[PDB]
Amino acid sequence: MVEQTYLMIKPDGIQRQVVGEIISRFEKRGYRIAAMKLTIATPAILEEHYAEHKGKPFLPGLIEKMTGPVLCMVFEGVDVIAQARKMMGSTRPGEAAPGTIRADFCQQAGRNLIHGSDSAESAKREISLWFKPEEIQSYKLALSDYIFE
Amino acid sequence: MVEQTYLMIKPDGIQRQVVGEIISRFEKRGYRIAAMKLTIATPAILEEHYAEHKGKPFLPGLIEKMTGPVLCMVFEGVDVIAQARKMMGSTRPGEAAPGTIRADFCQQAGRNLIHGSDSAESAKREISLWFKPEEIQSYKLALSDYIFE
Amino acid sequence: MVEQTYLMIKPDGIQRQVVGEIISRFEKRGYRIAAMKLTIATPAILEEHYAEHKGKPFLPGLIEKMTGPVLCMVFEGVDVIAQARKMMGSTRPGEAAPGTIRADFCQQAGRNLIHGSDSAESAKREISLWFKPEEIQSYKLALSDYIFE
Amino acid sequence: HMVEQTYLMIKPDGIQRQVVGEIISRFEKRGYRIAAMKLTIATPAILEEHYAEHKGKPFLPGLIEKMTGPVLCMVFEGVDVIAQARKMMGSTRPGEAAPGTIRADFCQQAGRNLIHGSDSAESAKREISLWFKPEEIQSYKLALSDYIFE
Amino acid sequence: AHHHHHHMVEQTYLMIKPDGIQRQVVGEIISRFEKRGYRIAAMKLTIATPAILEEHYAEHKGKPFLPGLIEKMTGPVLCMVFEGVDVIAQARKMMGSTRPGEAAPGTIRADFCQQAGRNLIHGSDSAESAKREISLWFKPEEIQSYKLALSDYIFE
Amino acid sequence: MVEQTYLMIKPDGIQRQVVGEIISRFEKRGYRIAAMKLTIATPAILEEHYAEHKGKPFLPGLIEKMTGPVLCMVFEGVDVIAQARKMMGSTRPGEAAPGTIRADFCQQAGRNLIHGSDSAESAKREISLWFKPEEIQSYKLALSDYIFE
Ligand SMILES: [Cl-]
Structure with missing residues (x-):
């Protein structure tokens, strides 16, 4: 059983031109790109995406920072939802562990990539x-026998 | 004066899981991602993509190799059409220059990434x-003053 | 005082073609390659290598997955036995720390590289x-004065 | 909005192992600004002044000897950069440092910890x-500031 | 579909010299050949x-530079066999010219080296x-026969 | 016989935050950092540095783009003057060979790193x-026996 998670490179990841490096970290574990746009x-x-924060004082500033180019992604793998969260690291980069994306690339939560x-x-x-349903692509990785038990 | 080129990662690039590395090579020059899916x-x-080869005996092989997951991309930069060709290298990887994508990653023209x-x-x-026109994204790179004359 | 540890790249490391990357992680700390085959x-x-697991339910499957090309290695360094274990990370990649081999490359314990x-x-x-004794090579690293206190 | 500056120094082992560029890249990667480098x-x-806190301790002479050699003096600027650079370097003892830190990734012993x-x-x-002399510290703004800082 | 056509493959002998071992760039060298889908058939x-070394450099027998070459090469080495399409000529292209200063950027010798006598x-x-x-x-039993799982995406 | 060359990272190399990558390319060949500031x-x-272009119409614009942070460097090696020029590639990045700094990072001669x-x-x-004379540092690389014939 694999699952799928939604990962989105924020405008700071686009503008700092680290999109390829981010993608490579997930490909390195044999996670499959199921969608990308x-x-x-x-x-x-963004208000729908951040619906859990509706009415909170920081929401307008969060929406402003996210109003820009983004790379929408779906990656598939074992436990990928929780594992991708571990790979990203703490929301605040200063608290994130070395080897995580936010620790390795960032300084502050409002620009955490x-x-x-x-x-x-x-x-x-x-x-x-x-994503639209037709944008999710089903295919099998050739190295599956060497990635999965 | 910038232009835009169409770059497409073929199924071998997807399956060998080098998508991020490919993207990083273009980002490294300050080329802007204008579209990706x-x-x-x-x-x-694919028959329309390869229409110039209509009626040639090798066309079905071109189509069969390409019938699979692909990453469609548009990159923008100065002289980017000719420059991306230089970065990919010769169609036959064995004839491509070291430091090009095809020489660095590949062996044969039918799997040239x-x-x-x-x-x-x-x-x-x-x-x-x-791409549909609504899929092409217009924004300015923050480092433009240090990339362009 | 240095010691030596046995490290073995499993068939998934061979087939995913990450042998060089694995070796580089150990070279990076100034560990010395004392043997390689x-x-x-x-x-x-494999039954002798995994003799401690004879009689366990998982042994037949482990042997099957390990019946393939492997890279046998001996690395020398201070505390290298325990330190290499730390660098590999937990047997289960999902529990392994960011920056370890298993966390960076893998998903499941049965394919943990x-x-x-x-x-x-x-x-x-x-x-x-x-390894036979004649296969263990003794030489001094040129940068020893800058690796060891 | 508040940044600070820390002193980072590549020790002679970092120079001799020719990993200066890699070290610098780790700090550049977080958008830290090079304010000084020589x-x-x-x-x-x-070195006796740099390590004045260790005056009189038995290990000091050997520490000074290992540090007598080429070094790269650096000042990096960023949010919380003093504590953040320590996190990125890892524990003084490489064997205790976390994977992903400089000391764990490159080193074996505290006396050669890069x-x-x-x-x-x-x-x-x-x-x-x-x-550093004052005129060796340079003031300029990173063009990517809007995408590094809140 | 995606399955490869049959191609004849070659095997080349590649040896990391003592400078490659001592500068601790073994992994980087191996990665360059793995990157093209070349198969490690042997490694020691x-x-x-x-x-x-005198047998290895038999073509240089009696030449005045041979003694110094042997001295440079007396040390740890990594013996390797890589397999791929046209791998003998391609590996030579990837190494670059004997003199690193003449080697093309992106080759091993241009990227890592300065002089022919230490060209890695x-x-x-x-x-x-x-x-x-x-x-x-290598002994015959040290050459390993197996197939790369990515063959359908490495080979046309 | 070694020589020393003057290499300077221009404001675009500082601002794009590729200083470490540039330095690593020269360290990779065993070139010695003799000075850095x-x-x-x-x-x-800058007028004295570009004295050869005195009176030429492009000189004011060149000086303007170069007025900013720079990393002054001296590297030492065999033939390092010509070799560093080869590693940088053509002044015009579009003409520069793949694998050179300007081809790998840049688009236009006015921002060529x-x-x-x-x-x-x-x-x-x-x-x-x-550089002042006391800023040039004399020391020997411990790897010398494996870099030089
Ligand atoms: Cl924060």
Whole structure:
């Protein structure tokens, strides 16, 4: 049993031109790219994405920072939702562990390069929000026998 | 004065899991990602993509190799069409220069990891074939003053 | 005072073609390659290597997965037995720390890329199993004065 | 909005193992700004002042001897950079340092642990002044600031 | 579909010289050949001695530079066999010119080295030399036959 | 017989934060850092540095782009003046060979990341211009026996 998580490179990842490095970290574990799309995030979609924060004082500033180019991604793998969260590291980069994306690339939570789903429920919701069903691609990795038990 | 080229990671680039490395090579020069999407190429679109080879005996082999997951990309930069061709290297990896993608990653022309547009006209045609206009994203790189004269 | 440990790249490390990357991680700390040999592991030698697991339900599957090309290695360094174990990370990649081999490359314990000795006793036994004394090479690293206190 | 500056010094082992660029890249990767950088050869006299906290301890003479050689003096600027650089360097003893840190990734023993970084705000001010003249510290703004800082 | 066509493959003898061992760039060198989907068919660390080096460099017998070459090469070496399409000529192209200063950027010798006498790596110059060098440095049972799982995406 | 060349990372190399990568390319060949200093280039020193272009119409724009942070460097090696020029590649990145700094990082001559001396006479003049004598450091690389014949 594999699962799928929603990962999104934020505008700072695009603008600092580290998209390839981010993708490589997930490919390195044999996670499969099931979907990928460059878009420019808009306030209306971001308000849905961040619905859990509705009415909170920091939400307007969060939406402003995210209004820009983003790379929407779906990666598939064993326990990938929780594992991708571990790979990203703490929301605050100063607290994140060395070897994680936020620790290795970033300084502050408001520019922390990447978003990943926090749960199976949120991954399903986020994938549906950002991707159309036909944009999720089903194929098998050739090295599957050497990646999976 | 910048232009845009169509670059497509072929199924071998997906399956060998070098997508991030490929993207990083173009980001390294300050080329801007104007569009990106993962799809599974169909014979119908591939026949149009390779229309110049219609009626040639090798065309079905071109289509069969490409019938699989691909990463469609548009990169923007100065002289990017010709420069991306130089970065990919010769169609036959054995004839490509060290430091090019095909020489660094590949052995044979039928598995040469990546496609790039040949010319201004073919770039325009290929971008329109593989992307809808709403999928092309316009934004400015923050480091523009240090990339461009 | 240096010691030596036995490290073995498993068939998944060979087939995913990450041998050089694995070796570089150990070279990076100034560990010295004292022995190295590519072989195809057989059930007979694998049963002796994994003798502590005879009678366990997982042994037949472990032997099957290990019956393939392997890279046998001996590395020398201060505390290298325990330190290589730390560098590999937990047997289960999902529990391994960021920056370890298993966390960076793998998903499941049954395909976890590499073996390393767990103790001085096991290192001595494993080195003797896979290498004859004449295969252990003694030389001094040129940068020794800058590696060892 | 508040950044600080720390003193980081590549020790002679970092120079001789020719990993200076890799070390610098690790700090550049987080958007830390190079405010000062110079190659020098450390002398016993400056090392005794740098390591004044260890005066009288038995290990000090050997520490000075190993540090007498080429070093790269550096000042990096960023949010919480003093403590952050210590996190990135890892434990003084490489065997105790976390994977992904400089000491764990490159080193074996504390006496050859590749790099020094200030341990506090007071030590950073003292060490920056000790090793650098004021005119060697450069002020400029990173073009990527809007995407590094909140 | 995606399955490869049959191609004849070659095997070349590549040897990391003592400078490659001592500068601790073994992994980086191996990665360059793995990156193209070349298969490791054999690999062994040894210490090269004058007698075996004299046979390795038999074409240089009696030449005045041979003694110094043997001295440089007396030390730890990594013996390797890599397999791939046209791998003998391709590996030579990847190593670059004998003189690193003449080697093309992106080759091993241009990227790592300064002078011919410390140029990090040896590779066979022809099929006949590869057969002879492999026999010199490896026993027959040390050559391993297996197939790369990514063959359908490495080979056309 | 070794020589010394003057290499200078231009403001675009500082601002794109590729200083470490540049330094690593020269360290990779066993070139010795003999001197290194971060400064801010002024028009007065830049006019002397570019004295050969006195009176030419492009000189004011060149000076303007170079007025910013720069990393002054001296590297020592066999034939290092010519070799560093080869490693940088053509002044115009579009003409530069794959694997060179300018081809790998840059798009246009006006933002081409790095300067290197063009001759022994220019290297001696440029080192004297940008460094005080006491800033040149004399020491021997411990890897010398494995770098030099
Ligand atoms: Cl924060």
